[PDB]
Design a protein around this ligand. Structure first.
Ligand SMILES: *[C@@H]1O[C@H](CO)[C@@H](O)[C@H](O)[C@H]1NC(C)=O
Ligand SMILES: O=C(O)c1cnccn1
Length: 515
């Protein structure tokens, strides 16, 4: 194909503008995924109680700090209980002689009148709107899991649809669906409806990602292709900083979810001016339209050789692409061939480790450290040098030790976070940030390495299985957080163990750098 691109400008003004236009959309797309650190933050809470919250009653001579101790019992973390209140105010508990043995646990009752939430950091969040606390605590990670499951299902649908209807068309309607479903999720009347709209938003997020990457590749000359996928990878890195920047200014969840969605109407609008993939048009038998796209790109690049092209030139020069239809393959082929079972298992395990660990940890930063805004910023700031250093080491040391050391770095940082005492919030934050940096570096490695471990006809099927396995593991990410009831160290132990074991397994893969 690339000879046509060289006649048209294989890197130039058009590809520069296209890369910029698609990177901006990827930034906003990243914010959509990261939003529920802020849209679904858990403000500290207690039961509603008459002496504290019905100020219209007879006036109080005591201070709130005394009334709270008189009204809400102490909880396990030596702080006011989040799910119980005294059935009758415990005036006896104010005296200096008093003890916790002065009341029976049967003297408490659950929050019949509902909860009161701390408004000092966030004005509102879905947790506070629909009382996703106490017996309902499981509903937050369920919502996160439903979003990630939407991404899995949308990716499964995108492939067939993209090959039938074209890269640009599916990208266009994906942008529209993101705008519409995000706006709808901002105004959901009930929690089931919020879940439905977040699922349908995720369904489109998958389409945007896949077709962004594909439509960059099918318009970029090979000499510049590694660079462009590196830039596509940094779009998400800037998205993390953008999430921190927007969420710092917009403390109200409806307004936040609306503000990050509105941009996709603009993305939808300018996706109509992008040219459709010429490879796809020729493969599907429409060289007359492909000629129009090619001459359009040549005009954008200010070129002069555009006069030379005709549909016969296209059909003659793109034969090498047209021939690709003759050799179909399937996922079972990866496991039936005895020499490839081993590679497939270990590689898929690495993909799974990336997805599971990242969307396990990155979606509860409120638990990993002291300040969520700086945490969300720094998992973007550190992700950039992690990725660049990964590329350098992946060139100098080879694929095998770089992937192994990256995953082991991630795992050992996350596991160390179970040892560091709770008082050292700064160090706990730093170790979490470094762990997520290692996971990003490992993503950079496994993307490339999975493209080299396999023979050329199975290459695409193997990368497909890998990315689908990452999508699948991400669903289990949030659900494993429910183990925290047995101790906050246990989810960290799981999130840390998975990358360690997969990193050790990666040492068994063959090195694919030629020397
Ligand atoms: C609040 O106190 C007023 C005092 O007159 C009382 O009439 C009202 O029923 C109380 N409401 C609640 C919810 O306790
Ligand atoms: O690893 C992936 O490809 C993934 C998983 N869940 C959500 C987004 N991306």
């Amino acid at each position: 194909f690339s000879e046509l691109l060289d006649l048209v400008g294989g890197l130039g003004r058009f590809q520069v503008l296209q890369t910029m236009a698609l990177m901006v959309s990827i930034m906003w797309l990243c914010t959509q995924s990261m939003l529920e650190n802020f849209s679904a933050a858990v403000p500290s809470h207690r039961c509603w109680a008459p002496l504290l919250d019905n100020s219209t009653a007879v006036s109080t001579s005591l201070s709130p700090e005394a009334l709270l101790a008189i009204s809400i019992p102490p909880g396990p973390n030596q702080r006011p209980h989040q799910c119980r209140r005294f059935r009758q105010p415990q005036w006896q508990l104010l005296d200096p002689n008093a003890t916790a043995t002065s009341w029976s646990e049967a003297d408490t009752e659950p929050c019949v009148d509902g909860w009161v939430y701390d408004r000092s950091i966030f004005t509102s969040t879905i947790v506070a709107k629909w009382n996703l606390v106490c017996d309902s605590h499981a509903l937050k990670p369920m919502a996160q899991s439903i979003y990630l499951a939407g991404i899995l299902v949308g990716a499964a649908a995108c492939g067939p649809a993209s090959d039938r209807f074209g890269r640009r068309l599916v990208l266009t309607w994906s942008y529209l669906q993101m705008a519409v479903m995000g706006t709808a999720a901002a105004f959901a009347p009930a929690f089931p409806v919020y879940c439905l709209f977040r699922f349908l938003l995720a369904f489109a997020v998958a389409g945007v990602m896949m077709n962004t990457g594909t439509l960059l590749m099918e318009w970029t000359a090979a000499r510049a292709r590694p660079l462009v996928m590196t830039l596509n990878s940094l779009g998400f890195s800037f998205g993390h900083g953008l999430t921190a920047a927007v969420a710092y200014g917009v403390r109200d969840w409806t307004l936040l979810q609306l503000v990050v969605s509105v941009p996709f109407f603009l993305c939808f609008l300018y996706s109509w001016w992008l040219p459709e993939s010429a490879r796809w048009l020729i493969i599907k038998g429409k060289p007359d339209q492909a000629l129009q796209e090619l001459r359009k790109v040549a005009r954008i690049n200010g070129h002069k050789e555009a006069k030379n092209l005709t549909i016969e030139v296209l059909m003659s020069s793109v034969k090498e692409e047209v021939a690709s239809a003759k050799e179909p393959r399937s996922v079972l082929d990866l496991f039936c061939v005895p020499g490839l079972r081993f590679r497939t298992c270990i590689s898929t395990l690495c993909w799974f480790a990336f997805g599971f660990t990242f969307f396990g940890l990155a979606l509860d930063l409120q638990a990993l450290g002291s300040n969520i805004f700086l945490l969300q910023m720094f998992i973007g700031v550190v992700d950039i040098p992690a990725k660049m250093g990964a590329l350098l080491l992946l060139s100098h040391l080879g694929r095998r030790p770089t992937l192994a050391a990256s995953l082991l770095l991630a795992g050992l940082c996350i596991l160390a976070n179970t040892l560091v005492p709770h008082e050292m919030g700064a160090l706990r934050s730093a170790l979490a940030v470094l762990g997520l940096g290692g996971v990003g570096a490992a993503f950079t490695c496994i993307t490339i390495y999975s493209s080299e471990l396999f023979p050329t006809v199975l290459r695409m099927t193997a990368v497909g299985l890998g990315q689908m396995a990452a999508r699948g593991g991400a669903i289990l990410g949030p659900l494993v957080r429910l183990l925290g009831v047995h101790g906050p160290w246990l989810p960290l132990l799981v999130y840390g163990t998975v990358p360690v074991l997969s990193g050790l397994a990666a040492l068994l893969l063959p090195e694919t750098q030629s020397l």
